[PDB]
Each structure stands twice: as C-alpha cells, then as structure tokens.
Amino acid sequence: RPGSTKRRQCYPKAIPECLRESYPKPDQPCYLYVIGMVLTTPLPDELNFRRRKLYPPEDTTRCFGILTAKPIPQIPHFPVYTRSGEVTISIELKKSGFTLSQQMLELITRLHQYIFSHILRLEKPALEFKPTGAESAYCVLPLNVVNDSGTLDIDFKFMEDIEKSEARIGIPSTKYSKETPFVFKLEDYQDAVIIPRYRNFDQPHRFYVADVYTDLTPLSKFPSPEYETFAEYYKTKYNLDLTNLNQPLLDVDHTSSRLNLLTPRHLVPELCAIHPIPASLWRKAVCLPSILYRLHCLLTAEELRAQTASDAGVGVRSLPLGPNPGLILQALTLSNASDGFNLERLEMLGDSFLKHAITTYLFCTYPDAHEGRLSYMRSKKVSNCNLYRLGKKKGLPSRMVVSIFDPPVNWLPPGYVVNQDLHTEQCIADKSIADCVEALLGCYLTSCGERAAQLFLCSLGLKVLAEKTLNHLISGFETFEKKINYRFKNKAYLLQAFTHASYHYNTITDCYQRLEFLGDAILDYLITKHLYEDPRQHSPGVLTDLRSALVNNTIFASLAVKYDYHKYFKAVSPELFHVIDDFVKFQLEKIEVPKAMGDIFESLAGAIYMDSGMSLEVVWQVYYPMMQPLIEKFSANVPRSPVRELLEMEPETAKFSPAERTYDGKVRVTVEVVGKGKFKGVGRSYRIAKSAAARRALRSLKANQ
RNA sequence: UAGCAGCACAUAAUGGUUUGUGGAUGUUGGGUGCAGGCCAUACUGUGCUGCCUCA
C-alpha cells in the first residue's frame, strides 16, 4: 500500500541550485570562497595512538578556496573530526564579480581534476571528469597568504609550479650519481608529501614528513626487522646504491584513506620524490569530501528553509527568521545514515501537533458532525499514505539523507559524471517520506512556533486554517470552577462537557463527545510538547513510552475522580452511576474503569479551549497542575506492563496459556512459573486476563522473596 | 597506502513471531491495514581481531 514500509521506490539525489551548473566561464564574473578551518577540540593523546603532533589547520598560510559562477549562501559553521580532533569549518566569501582568463581557468580546472583523481584517488573506471557536463560543477583551488599580510589570494605561482613539476604525472626519473650526488635541503621537507621511487609503481604510497631526523642516516638501523640498515635495505630490495650515505632520514606517516570525517571515531630522502603539494595543504585536501558533502547537505537544507519561507511565509527568504538549517538537516536524516542525529524526536512532536491542528480544523469546519465521523475523517488525513503523497509532492525524497556517507562508493565529486547507481540514486520506503513530513513539522514548531507550523501545514496542502435552563443545570458548578481554579465565560461549554448522551434533560447543548474529540488531541499534544521540552531530554523510545503511559483514558479517569468531576457528571443510566461509584470507591481506597470519566476529562479540556478563545496555554495552565504529579512520577520511573515485568523477572520459567473463553464470555489465562506455581487471571479481554494472571504471579514471587 | 575471513555493534531489505490498534459478512471473537518488541535469510559501515600484500 502507498505509505507502507513494504513499498520502496528509487529517487535521484538533489543537488543545490547554487552548485548546479556552477562552472566558471572565461572572462565572466565568478565568486571565490575561503574554506576557514579552526581546531576547536583537540584529540586526547590516549586516542592519538602514535602520540603524533596535532596539526591545527589554522597554523599554516596555505588553504583551499571554492571557485564558482553562482554565489554560496551563509551556512552554519560545522565540525569535522580529523586525526587532530574536532575542526570547526567556515565558508567565507573572499572575492566577488572578478574575471579569470582561459589559461588561469585551465590551470585551476587541471589542478582541480588532479586533486580528486591523483591526490584523493576518487576517480574510478565508472567515473569521468567532465566539468562542463557535470551536474555539480565547481572548482577547488589553493589560496595563500600574500607577503605575510594575513590576506589570502589565489596561489597561481604554486599552481604553475605543480604543472612544471615532472612529479605530477608519475615518479620522477632523476637518478643521482657520483658526478651529481644528492643534496638534502631541509626547507624542501619540513612540510612535504613524499613518494618512494623504487616500489608500488601502479599505486605509489604517499607519506607526510612528520619529522626530519638529522641524527639518523642511511647507515642507521632499519624499521622492518628484515634488514640491518636503510642502505642494506635499498641495495637488497631494489639494487640501489646511495650517493649520500650521510643524508638525514625522514619520519613519515601514511596519507589517510578514511575520507568520511562527519562523526567522531570514539625513509631516505634521495630515494623519495617530493610531491609539489605541501603536507599541510594535503591534510586540508583529505577533508574536502566530508566538507563538500556537508556543504552540499546544508545547502539543500537551507534551500528547503528558503523555499518554505517563500511558500508558507514562515521566516525570511535570505538571512541578515525561520529554523536553523542544521535542524532541517536533522529532519531530513534517517537513523540509517548514522550521522550522530536523526528525525525521530522531531517526528513524534510533529505527529502530536498534526493531530491537534487537524482535529481543531475538523471540529470548527464541521460543527454538526458527530465524534465517530470527525475521528474517521481525522484518521484519513493523518495517515502515513496521505503524508507520503504530501512529502513526495514537496520533493523531500531526493533531499533525504538515507545512507552512510562513503566517498569512493556513494559520492560523485564536483566536475565528474557517471559512465552509463549508488552515486546518483537512493532507495526509500514510502513510510520514511511520511515520517520526514512530521519531523519537518516538529522542526518548524520547535523553532518558529505553532502558527508557523500551521502555515507550514497549509503550504504542504493540508487545510488547517435556554439561559434559565443553563443556570438550572449548572447549579453548584461554582465549587468545581474554584477547584479547577478556572471560571467559564460561557457555562454552556461546562454543561456540555459534563452531559452524557443518556441525559435527555439537556436540550440546550450537545453531549460531551465532540469536546472529548477536541480535548483528546489537545492533551496528546500538550503532554508530548512538555515531554519533548523536558530538561531530562528523553530518548525517542522513552518519549514513546511516556506518551503512551500519560495519554491514556485510565489516567484521565483517575484524575477526573481526584478532581471531583464525577460529582458534576450529568447522566441517566443507573448502571453507569454504580460503575462510577465502585471506581470512585476503589480510587478513594488506594474493577471496570468507567470510559465516561476519562472522556469528560478530555471534554473539559475541549470546553476550556473553546471558552478561552482557542488558548492552548489557558488549557495547559488548568491541566498542567493536575497532571504535574503523574508527569513527574512517570518521567522519574518510566512505567511497565505486568506481563513484561514477569517475563523480565522469569524469562525461561514464565509461560502463558492460550486464551480460554469462559461460560460468561470473559477470557481466562493461566501463567505457569516453572518451580514456582500456576496463577489464573480473568477479564473481558486476553490482556486484562493475562495481566491479572501476571500480577498474581508477580505478587506470589515478591511475597516468597 | 592495499585485499580478504572471523567476532561486537548500528543499520535498512524479504520472510515469520509477538503487544497495541482500526472500521469490517462482523450468527456469540478468524479478513485485512499501520506501529512498536523478538526469530530467521541476506546488505553495508565502523570497530575488536585473524590471515595475507609493501615497508
């Protein structure tokens, strides 16, 4: 069925408007952004297993810049988890409206290809570099501080030096001889990436110079137990005789193969070619996939924020407000993506508000429709099927973050195309599209409030925007008004809330059921909002349990009794009065729970809402003090099913019998606890019977301890 | 800077199981829809390893 977990559809991945077809043209205006990088949380030495120097990206003059034909909007700064620790990333506009020659652009584009294909090794047989044909079409280039002025500019000299370098295309063929002996220059290695010239020619291993040992030489002990010295090693393995046996040695670290950095984890110089790119900049380059991917994701969320400000009139289209793009990114992220956050908290809050909004709308739009009809209409509008259709219509599937980020397996680099797919497409369940709509609603609600959330629903396509008899029938309710600490402006709502369908003496208002319908959704929402805003920051699972335990007719009935609602209840059913008196007796001492007592509790919430001029706050002011003791009790001690508690205490020993229908229509259930006895429970339903059996077993077990 | 095979965990897919829930021919409750918790087949990622490339 549409909106079901069992139905899956494939969708193309969305690329932000500011990155789509964004390739700089010769002699045309372009934009240059600096990738600002700051080490905000250094990695502890215990996690840094080699205890290597942490390299704050900010300690070095060279960085990367993004060159694009279209402007990039302001995005929140975001963390990246490097081997140095948490690095906060900023994307900062450095130059706008400037032009580049064909030769300058060719140098930039060639170096851009060189980064992704040669440095990062992301170009695969399935991928082709087509910068003019690629959907995501921007260039990345080196920036450097000009003359120590602290001002960053395009390092053209360095790009040209990379082009003149033979080391660009492969391993340099410069073999040293006794006539042309190798000369070590320290300045050339302090911030160098090196390539060993005698091995692994198809995939040359690259290393960062971590340090230069001036005390160690080719005659010193080799790190592999296979050889006595560095000179013996090269002579034995590659037949290479060194010209300079007194040259210093390089301490080196492998260039990182891990390109996903979005979450926390917790040699002889003469025989090496110097890669023309410095090690500092190469460390920055390794972050480009996570940075660009995150940038792309945040730009998609900002695009959705801006689109919603245009379509719903919620927030401002361009920031100097609407929700933070990071919260939108949360609402667009499935738990499968493993990105440190998920849509589940926002989804649950949205659902509760959605119910409230539709319930209110239906109640006001259909003044003559009975509860069962409003409940039926409600059930259709809030369905996972309808929500899926709305999310699909809004283009959410192409914007959702569904799978774990893996650059060489599921990411397309800028300027590349796929040779005709984990790079361009994703498979999504219809239910997940529905869940995302509720999470977006929760985002707008938490960030911009209820009116904004309603305007957001309207933007998705959900339309969400006698007197003598009265005085006689309300006689004595003044004590009730004082007990609840609320005075009704229109006592007809109070009368309606306490009028059962059997109470035909009331010919001036309806029965309580319509207000029950309205109140149910109000209480669910208010309770859910409160639980979501709770300082304990309950998990999605715990929020579900607490919502289930607090939003319950039994609890509403228990409160109705404690607050004397039963004394004001108007009914003409002696049996109902006896059931209420028996339940009231049971509640006063500490057995069927009278449904009507929970219903009138909800109906009075509906009454107060209508009498207060649709003020949820007034309703909450009245109900929160009544519910606060229970909210505190269950949020301190998250509740349990007696069947589950018995199964937790006795998992292999407690076995329940099938449902036995007794001669009176009532169900009987027996629980056998191996070595501890058999306990029988009876009730009008299998759980009432099974729970009664489980409670009898639990009582016996606890009494024998 | 490489590949593979075990173990932990997360995770979606296709089956089953179990709690909640719905209007339904509802002769007095087994027809189907959606959620949770489990069992199985099979996917990916990180990590604890193990073998195994270069050093």
Numbering used by the authors: 739 to 1004, 1033 to 1086, 1290 to 1389, 1543 to 1587, 1649 to 1773, 1796 to 1910
Provide excerpts from the study.
Vertebrate genomes carry a single highly conserved Dicer (Dicer-1) gene (Jia et al., 2017), which encodes a ∼220 kDa multidomain protein that appears dedicated to the miRNA pathway. Cryoelectron microscopy (cryo-EM) of human Dicer revealed a protein architecture that resembles the letter “L,” with a complex helicase domain at the base, tandem RNase III domains in the core, and Piwi/Argonaute/Zwille (PAZ)-platform domains at the cap (Lau et al., 2009, 2012; Taylor et al., 2013; Liu et al., 2018). During miRNA biogenesis, the PAZ domain, which has a strong affinity for substrates with blunt-ends or short 3′ protruding overhangs (Lingel et al., 2003; Song et al., 2003; Yan et al., 2003), binds the base of a pre-miRNA stem loop and the two RNase III domains function as catalytic “half sites,” each cleaving one strand of the double-stranded substrate (Zhang et al., 2004). The helicase domain, which has a clamp-like architecture of the RIG-I family of RNA helicases (Fairman-Williams et al., 2010), is located near RNase III domains and is composed of three globular subdomains: an N-terminal DExD/H subdomain (HEL1), which is separated by an insertion subdomain (HEL2i) from a helicase superfamily C-terminal subdomain (HEL2).
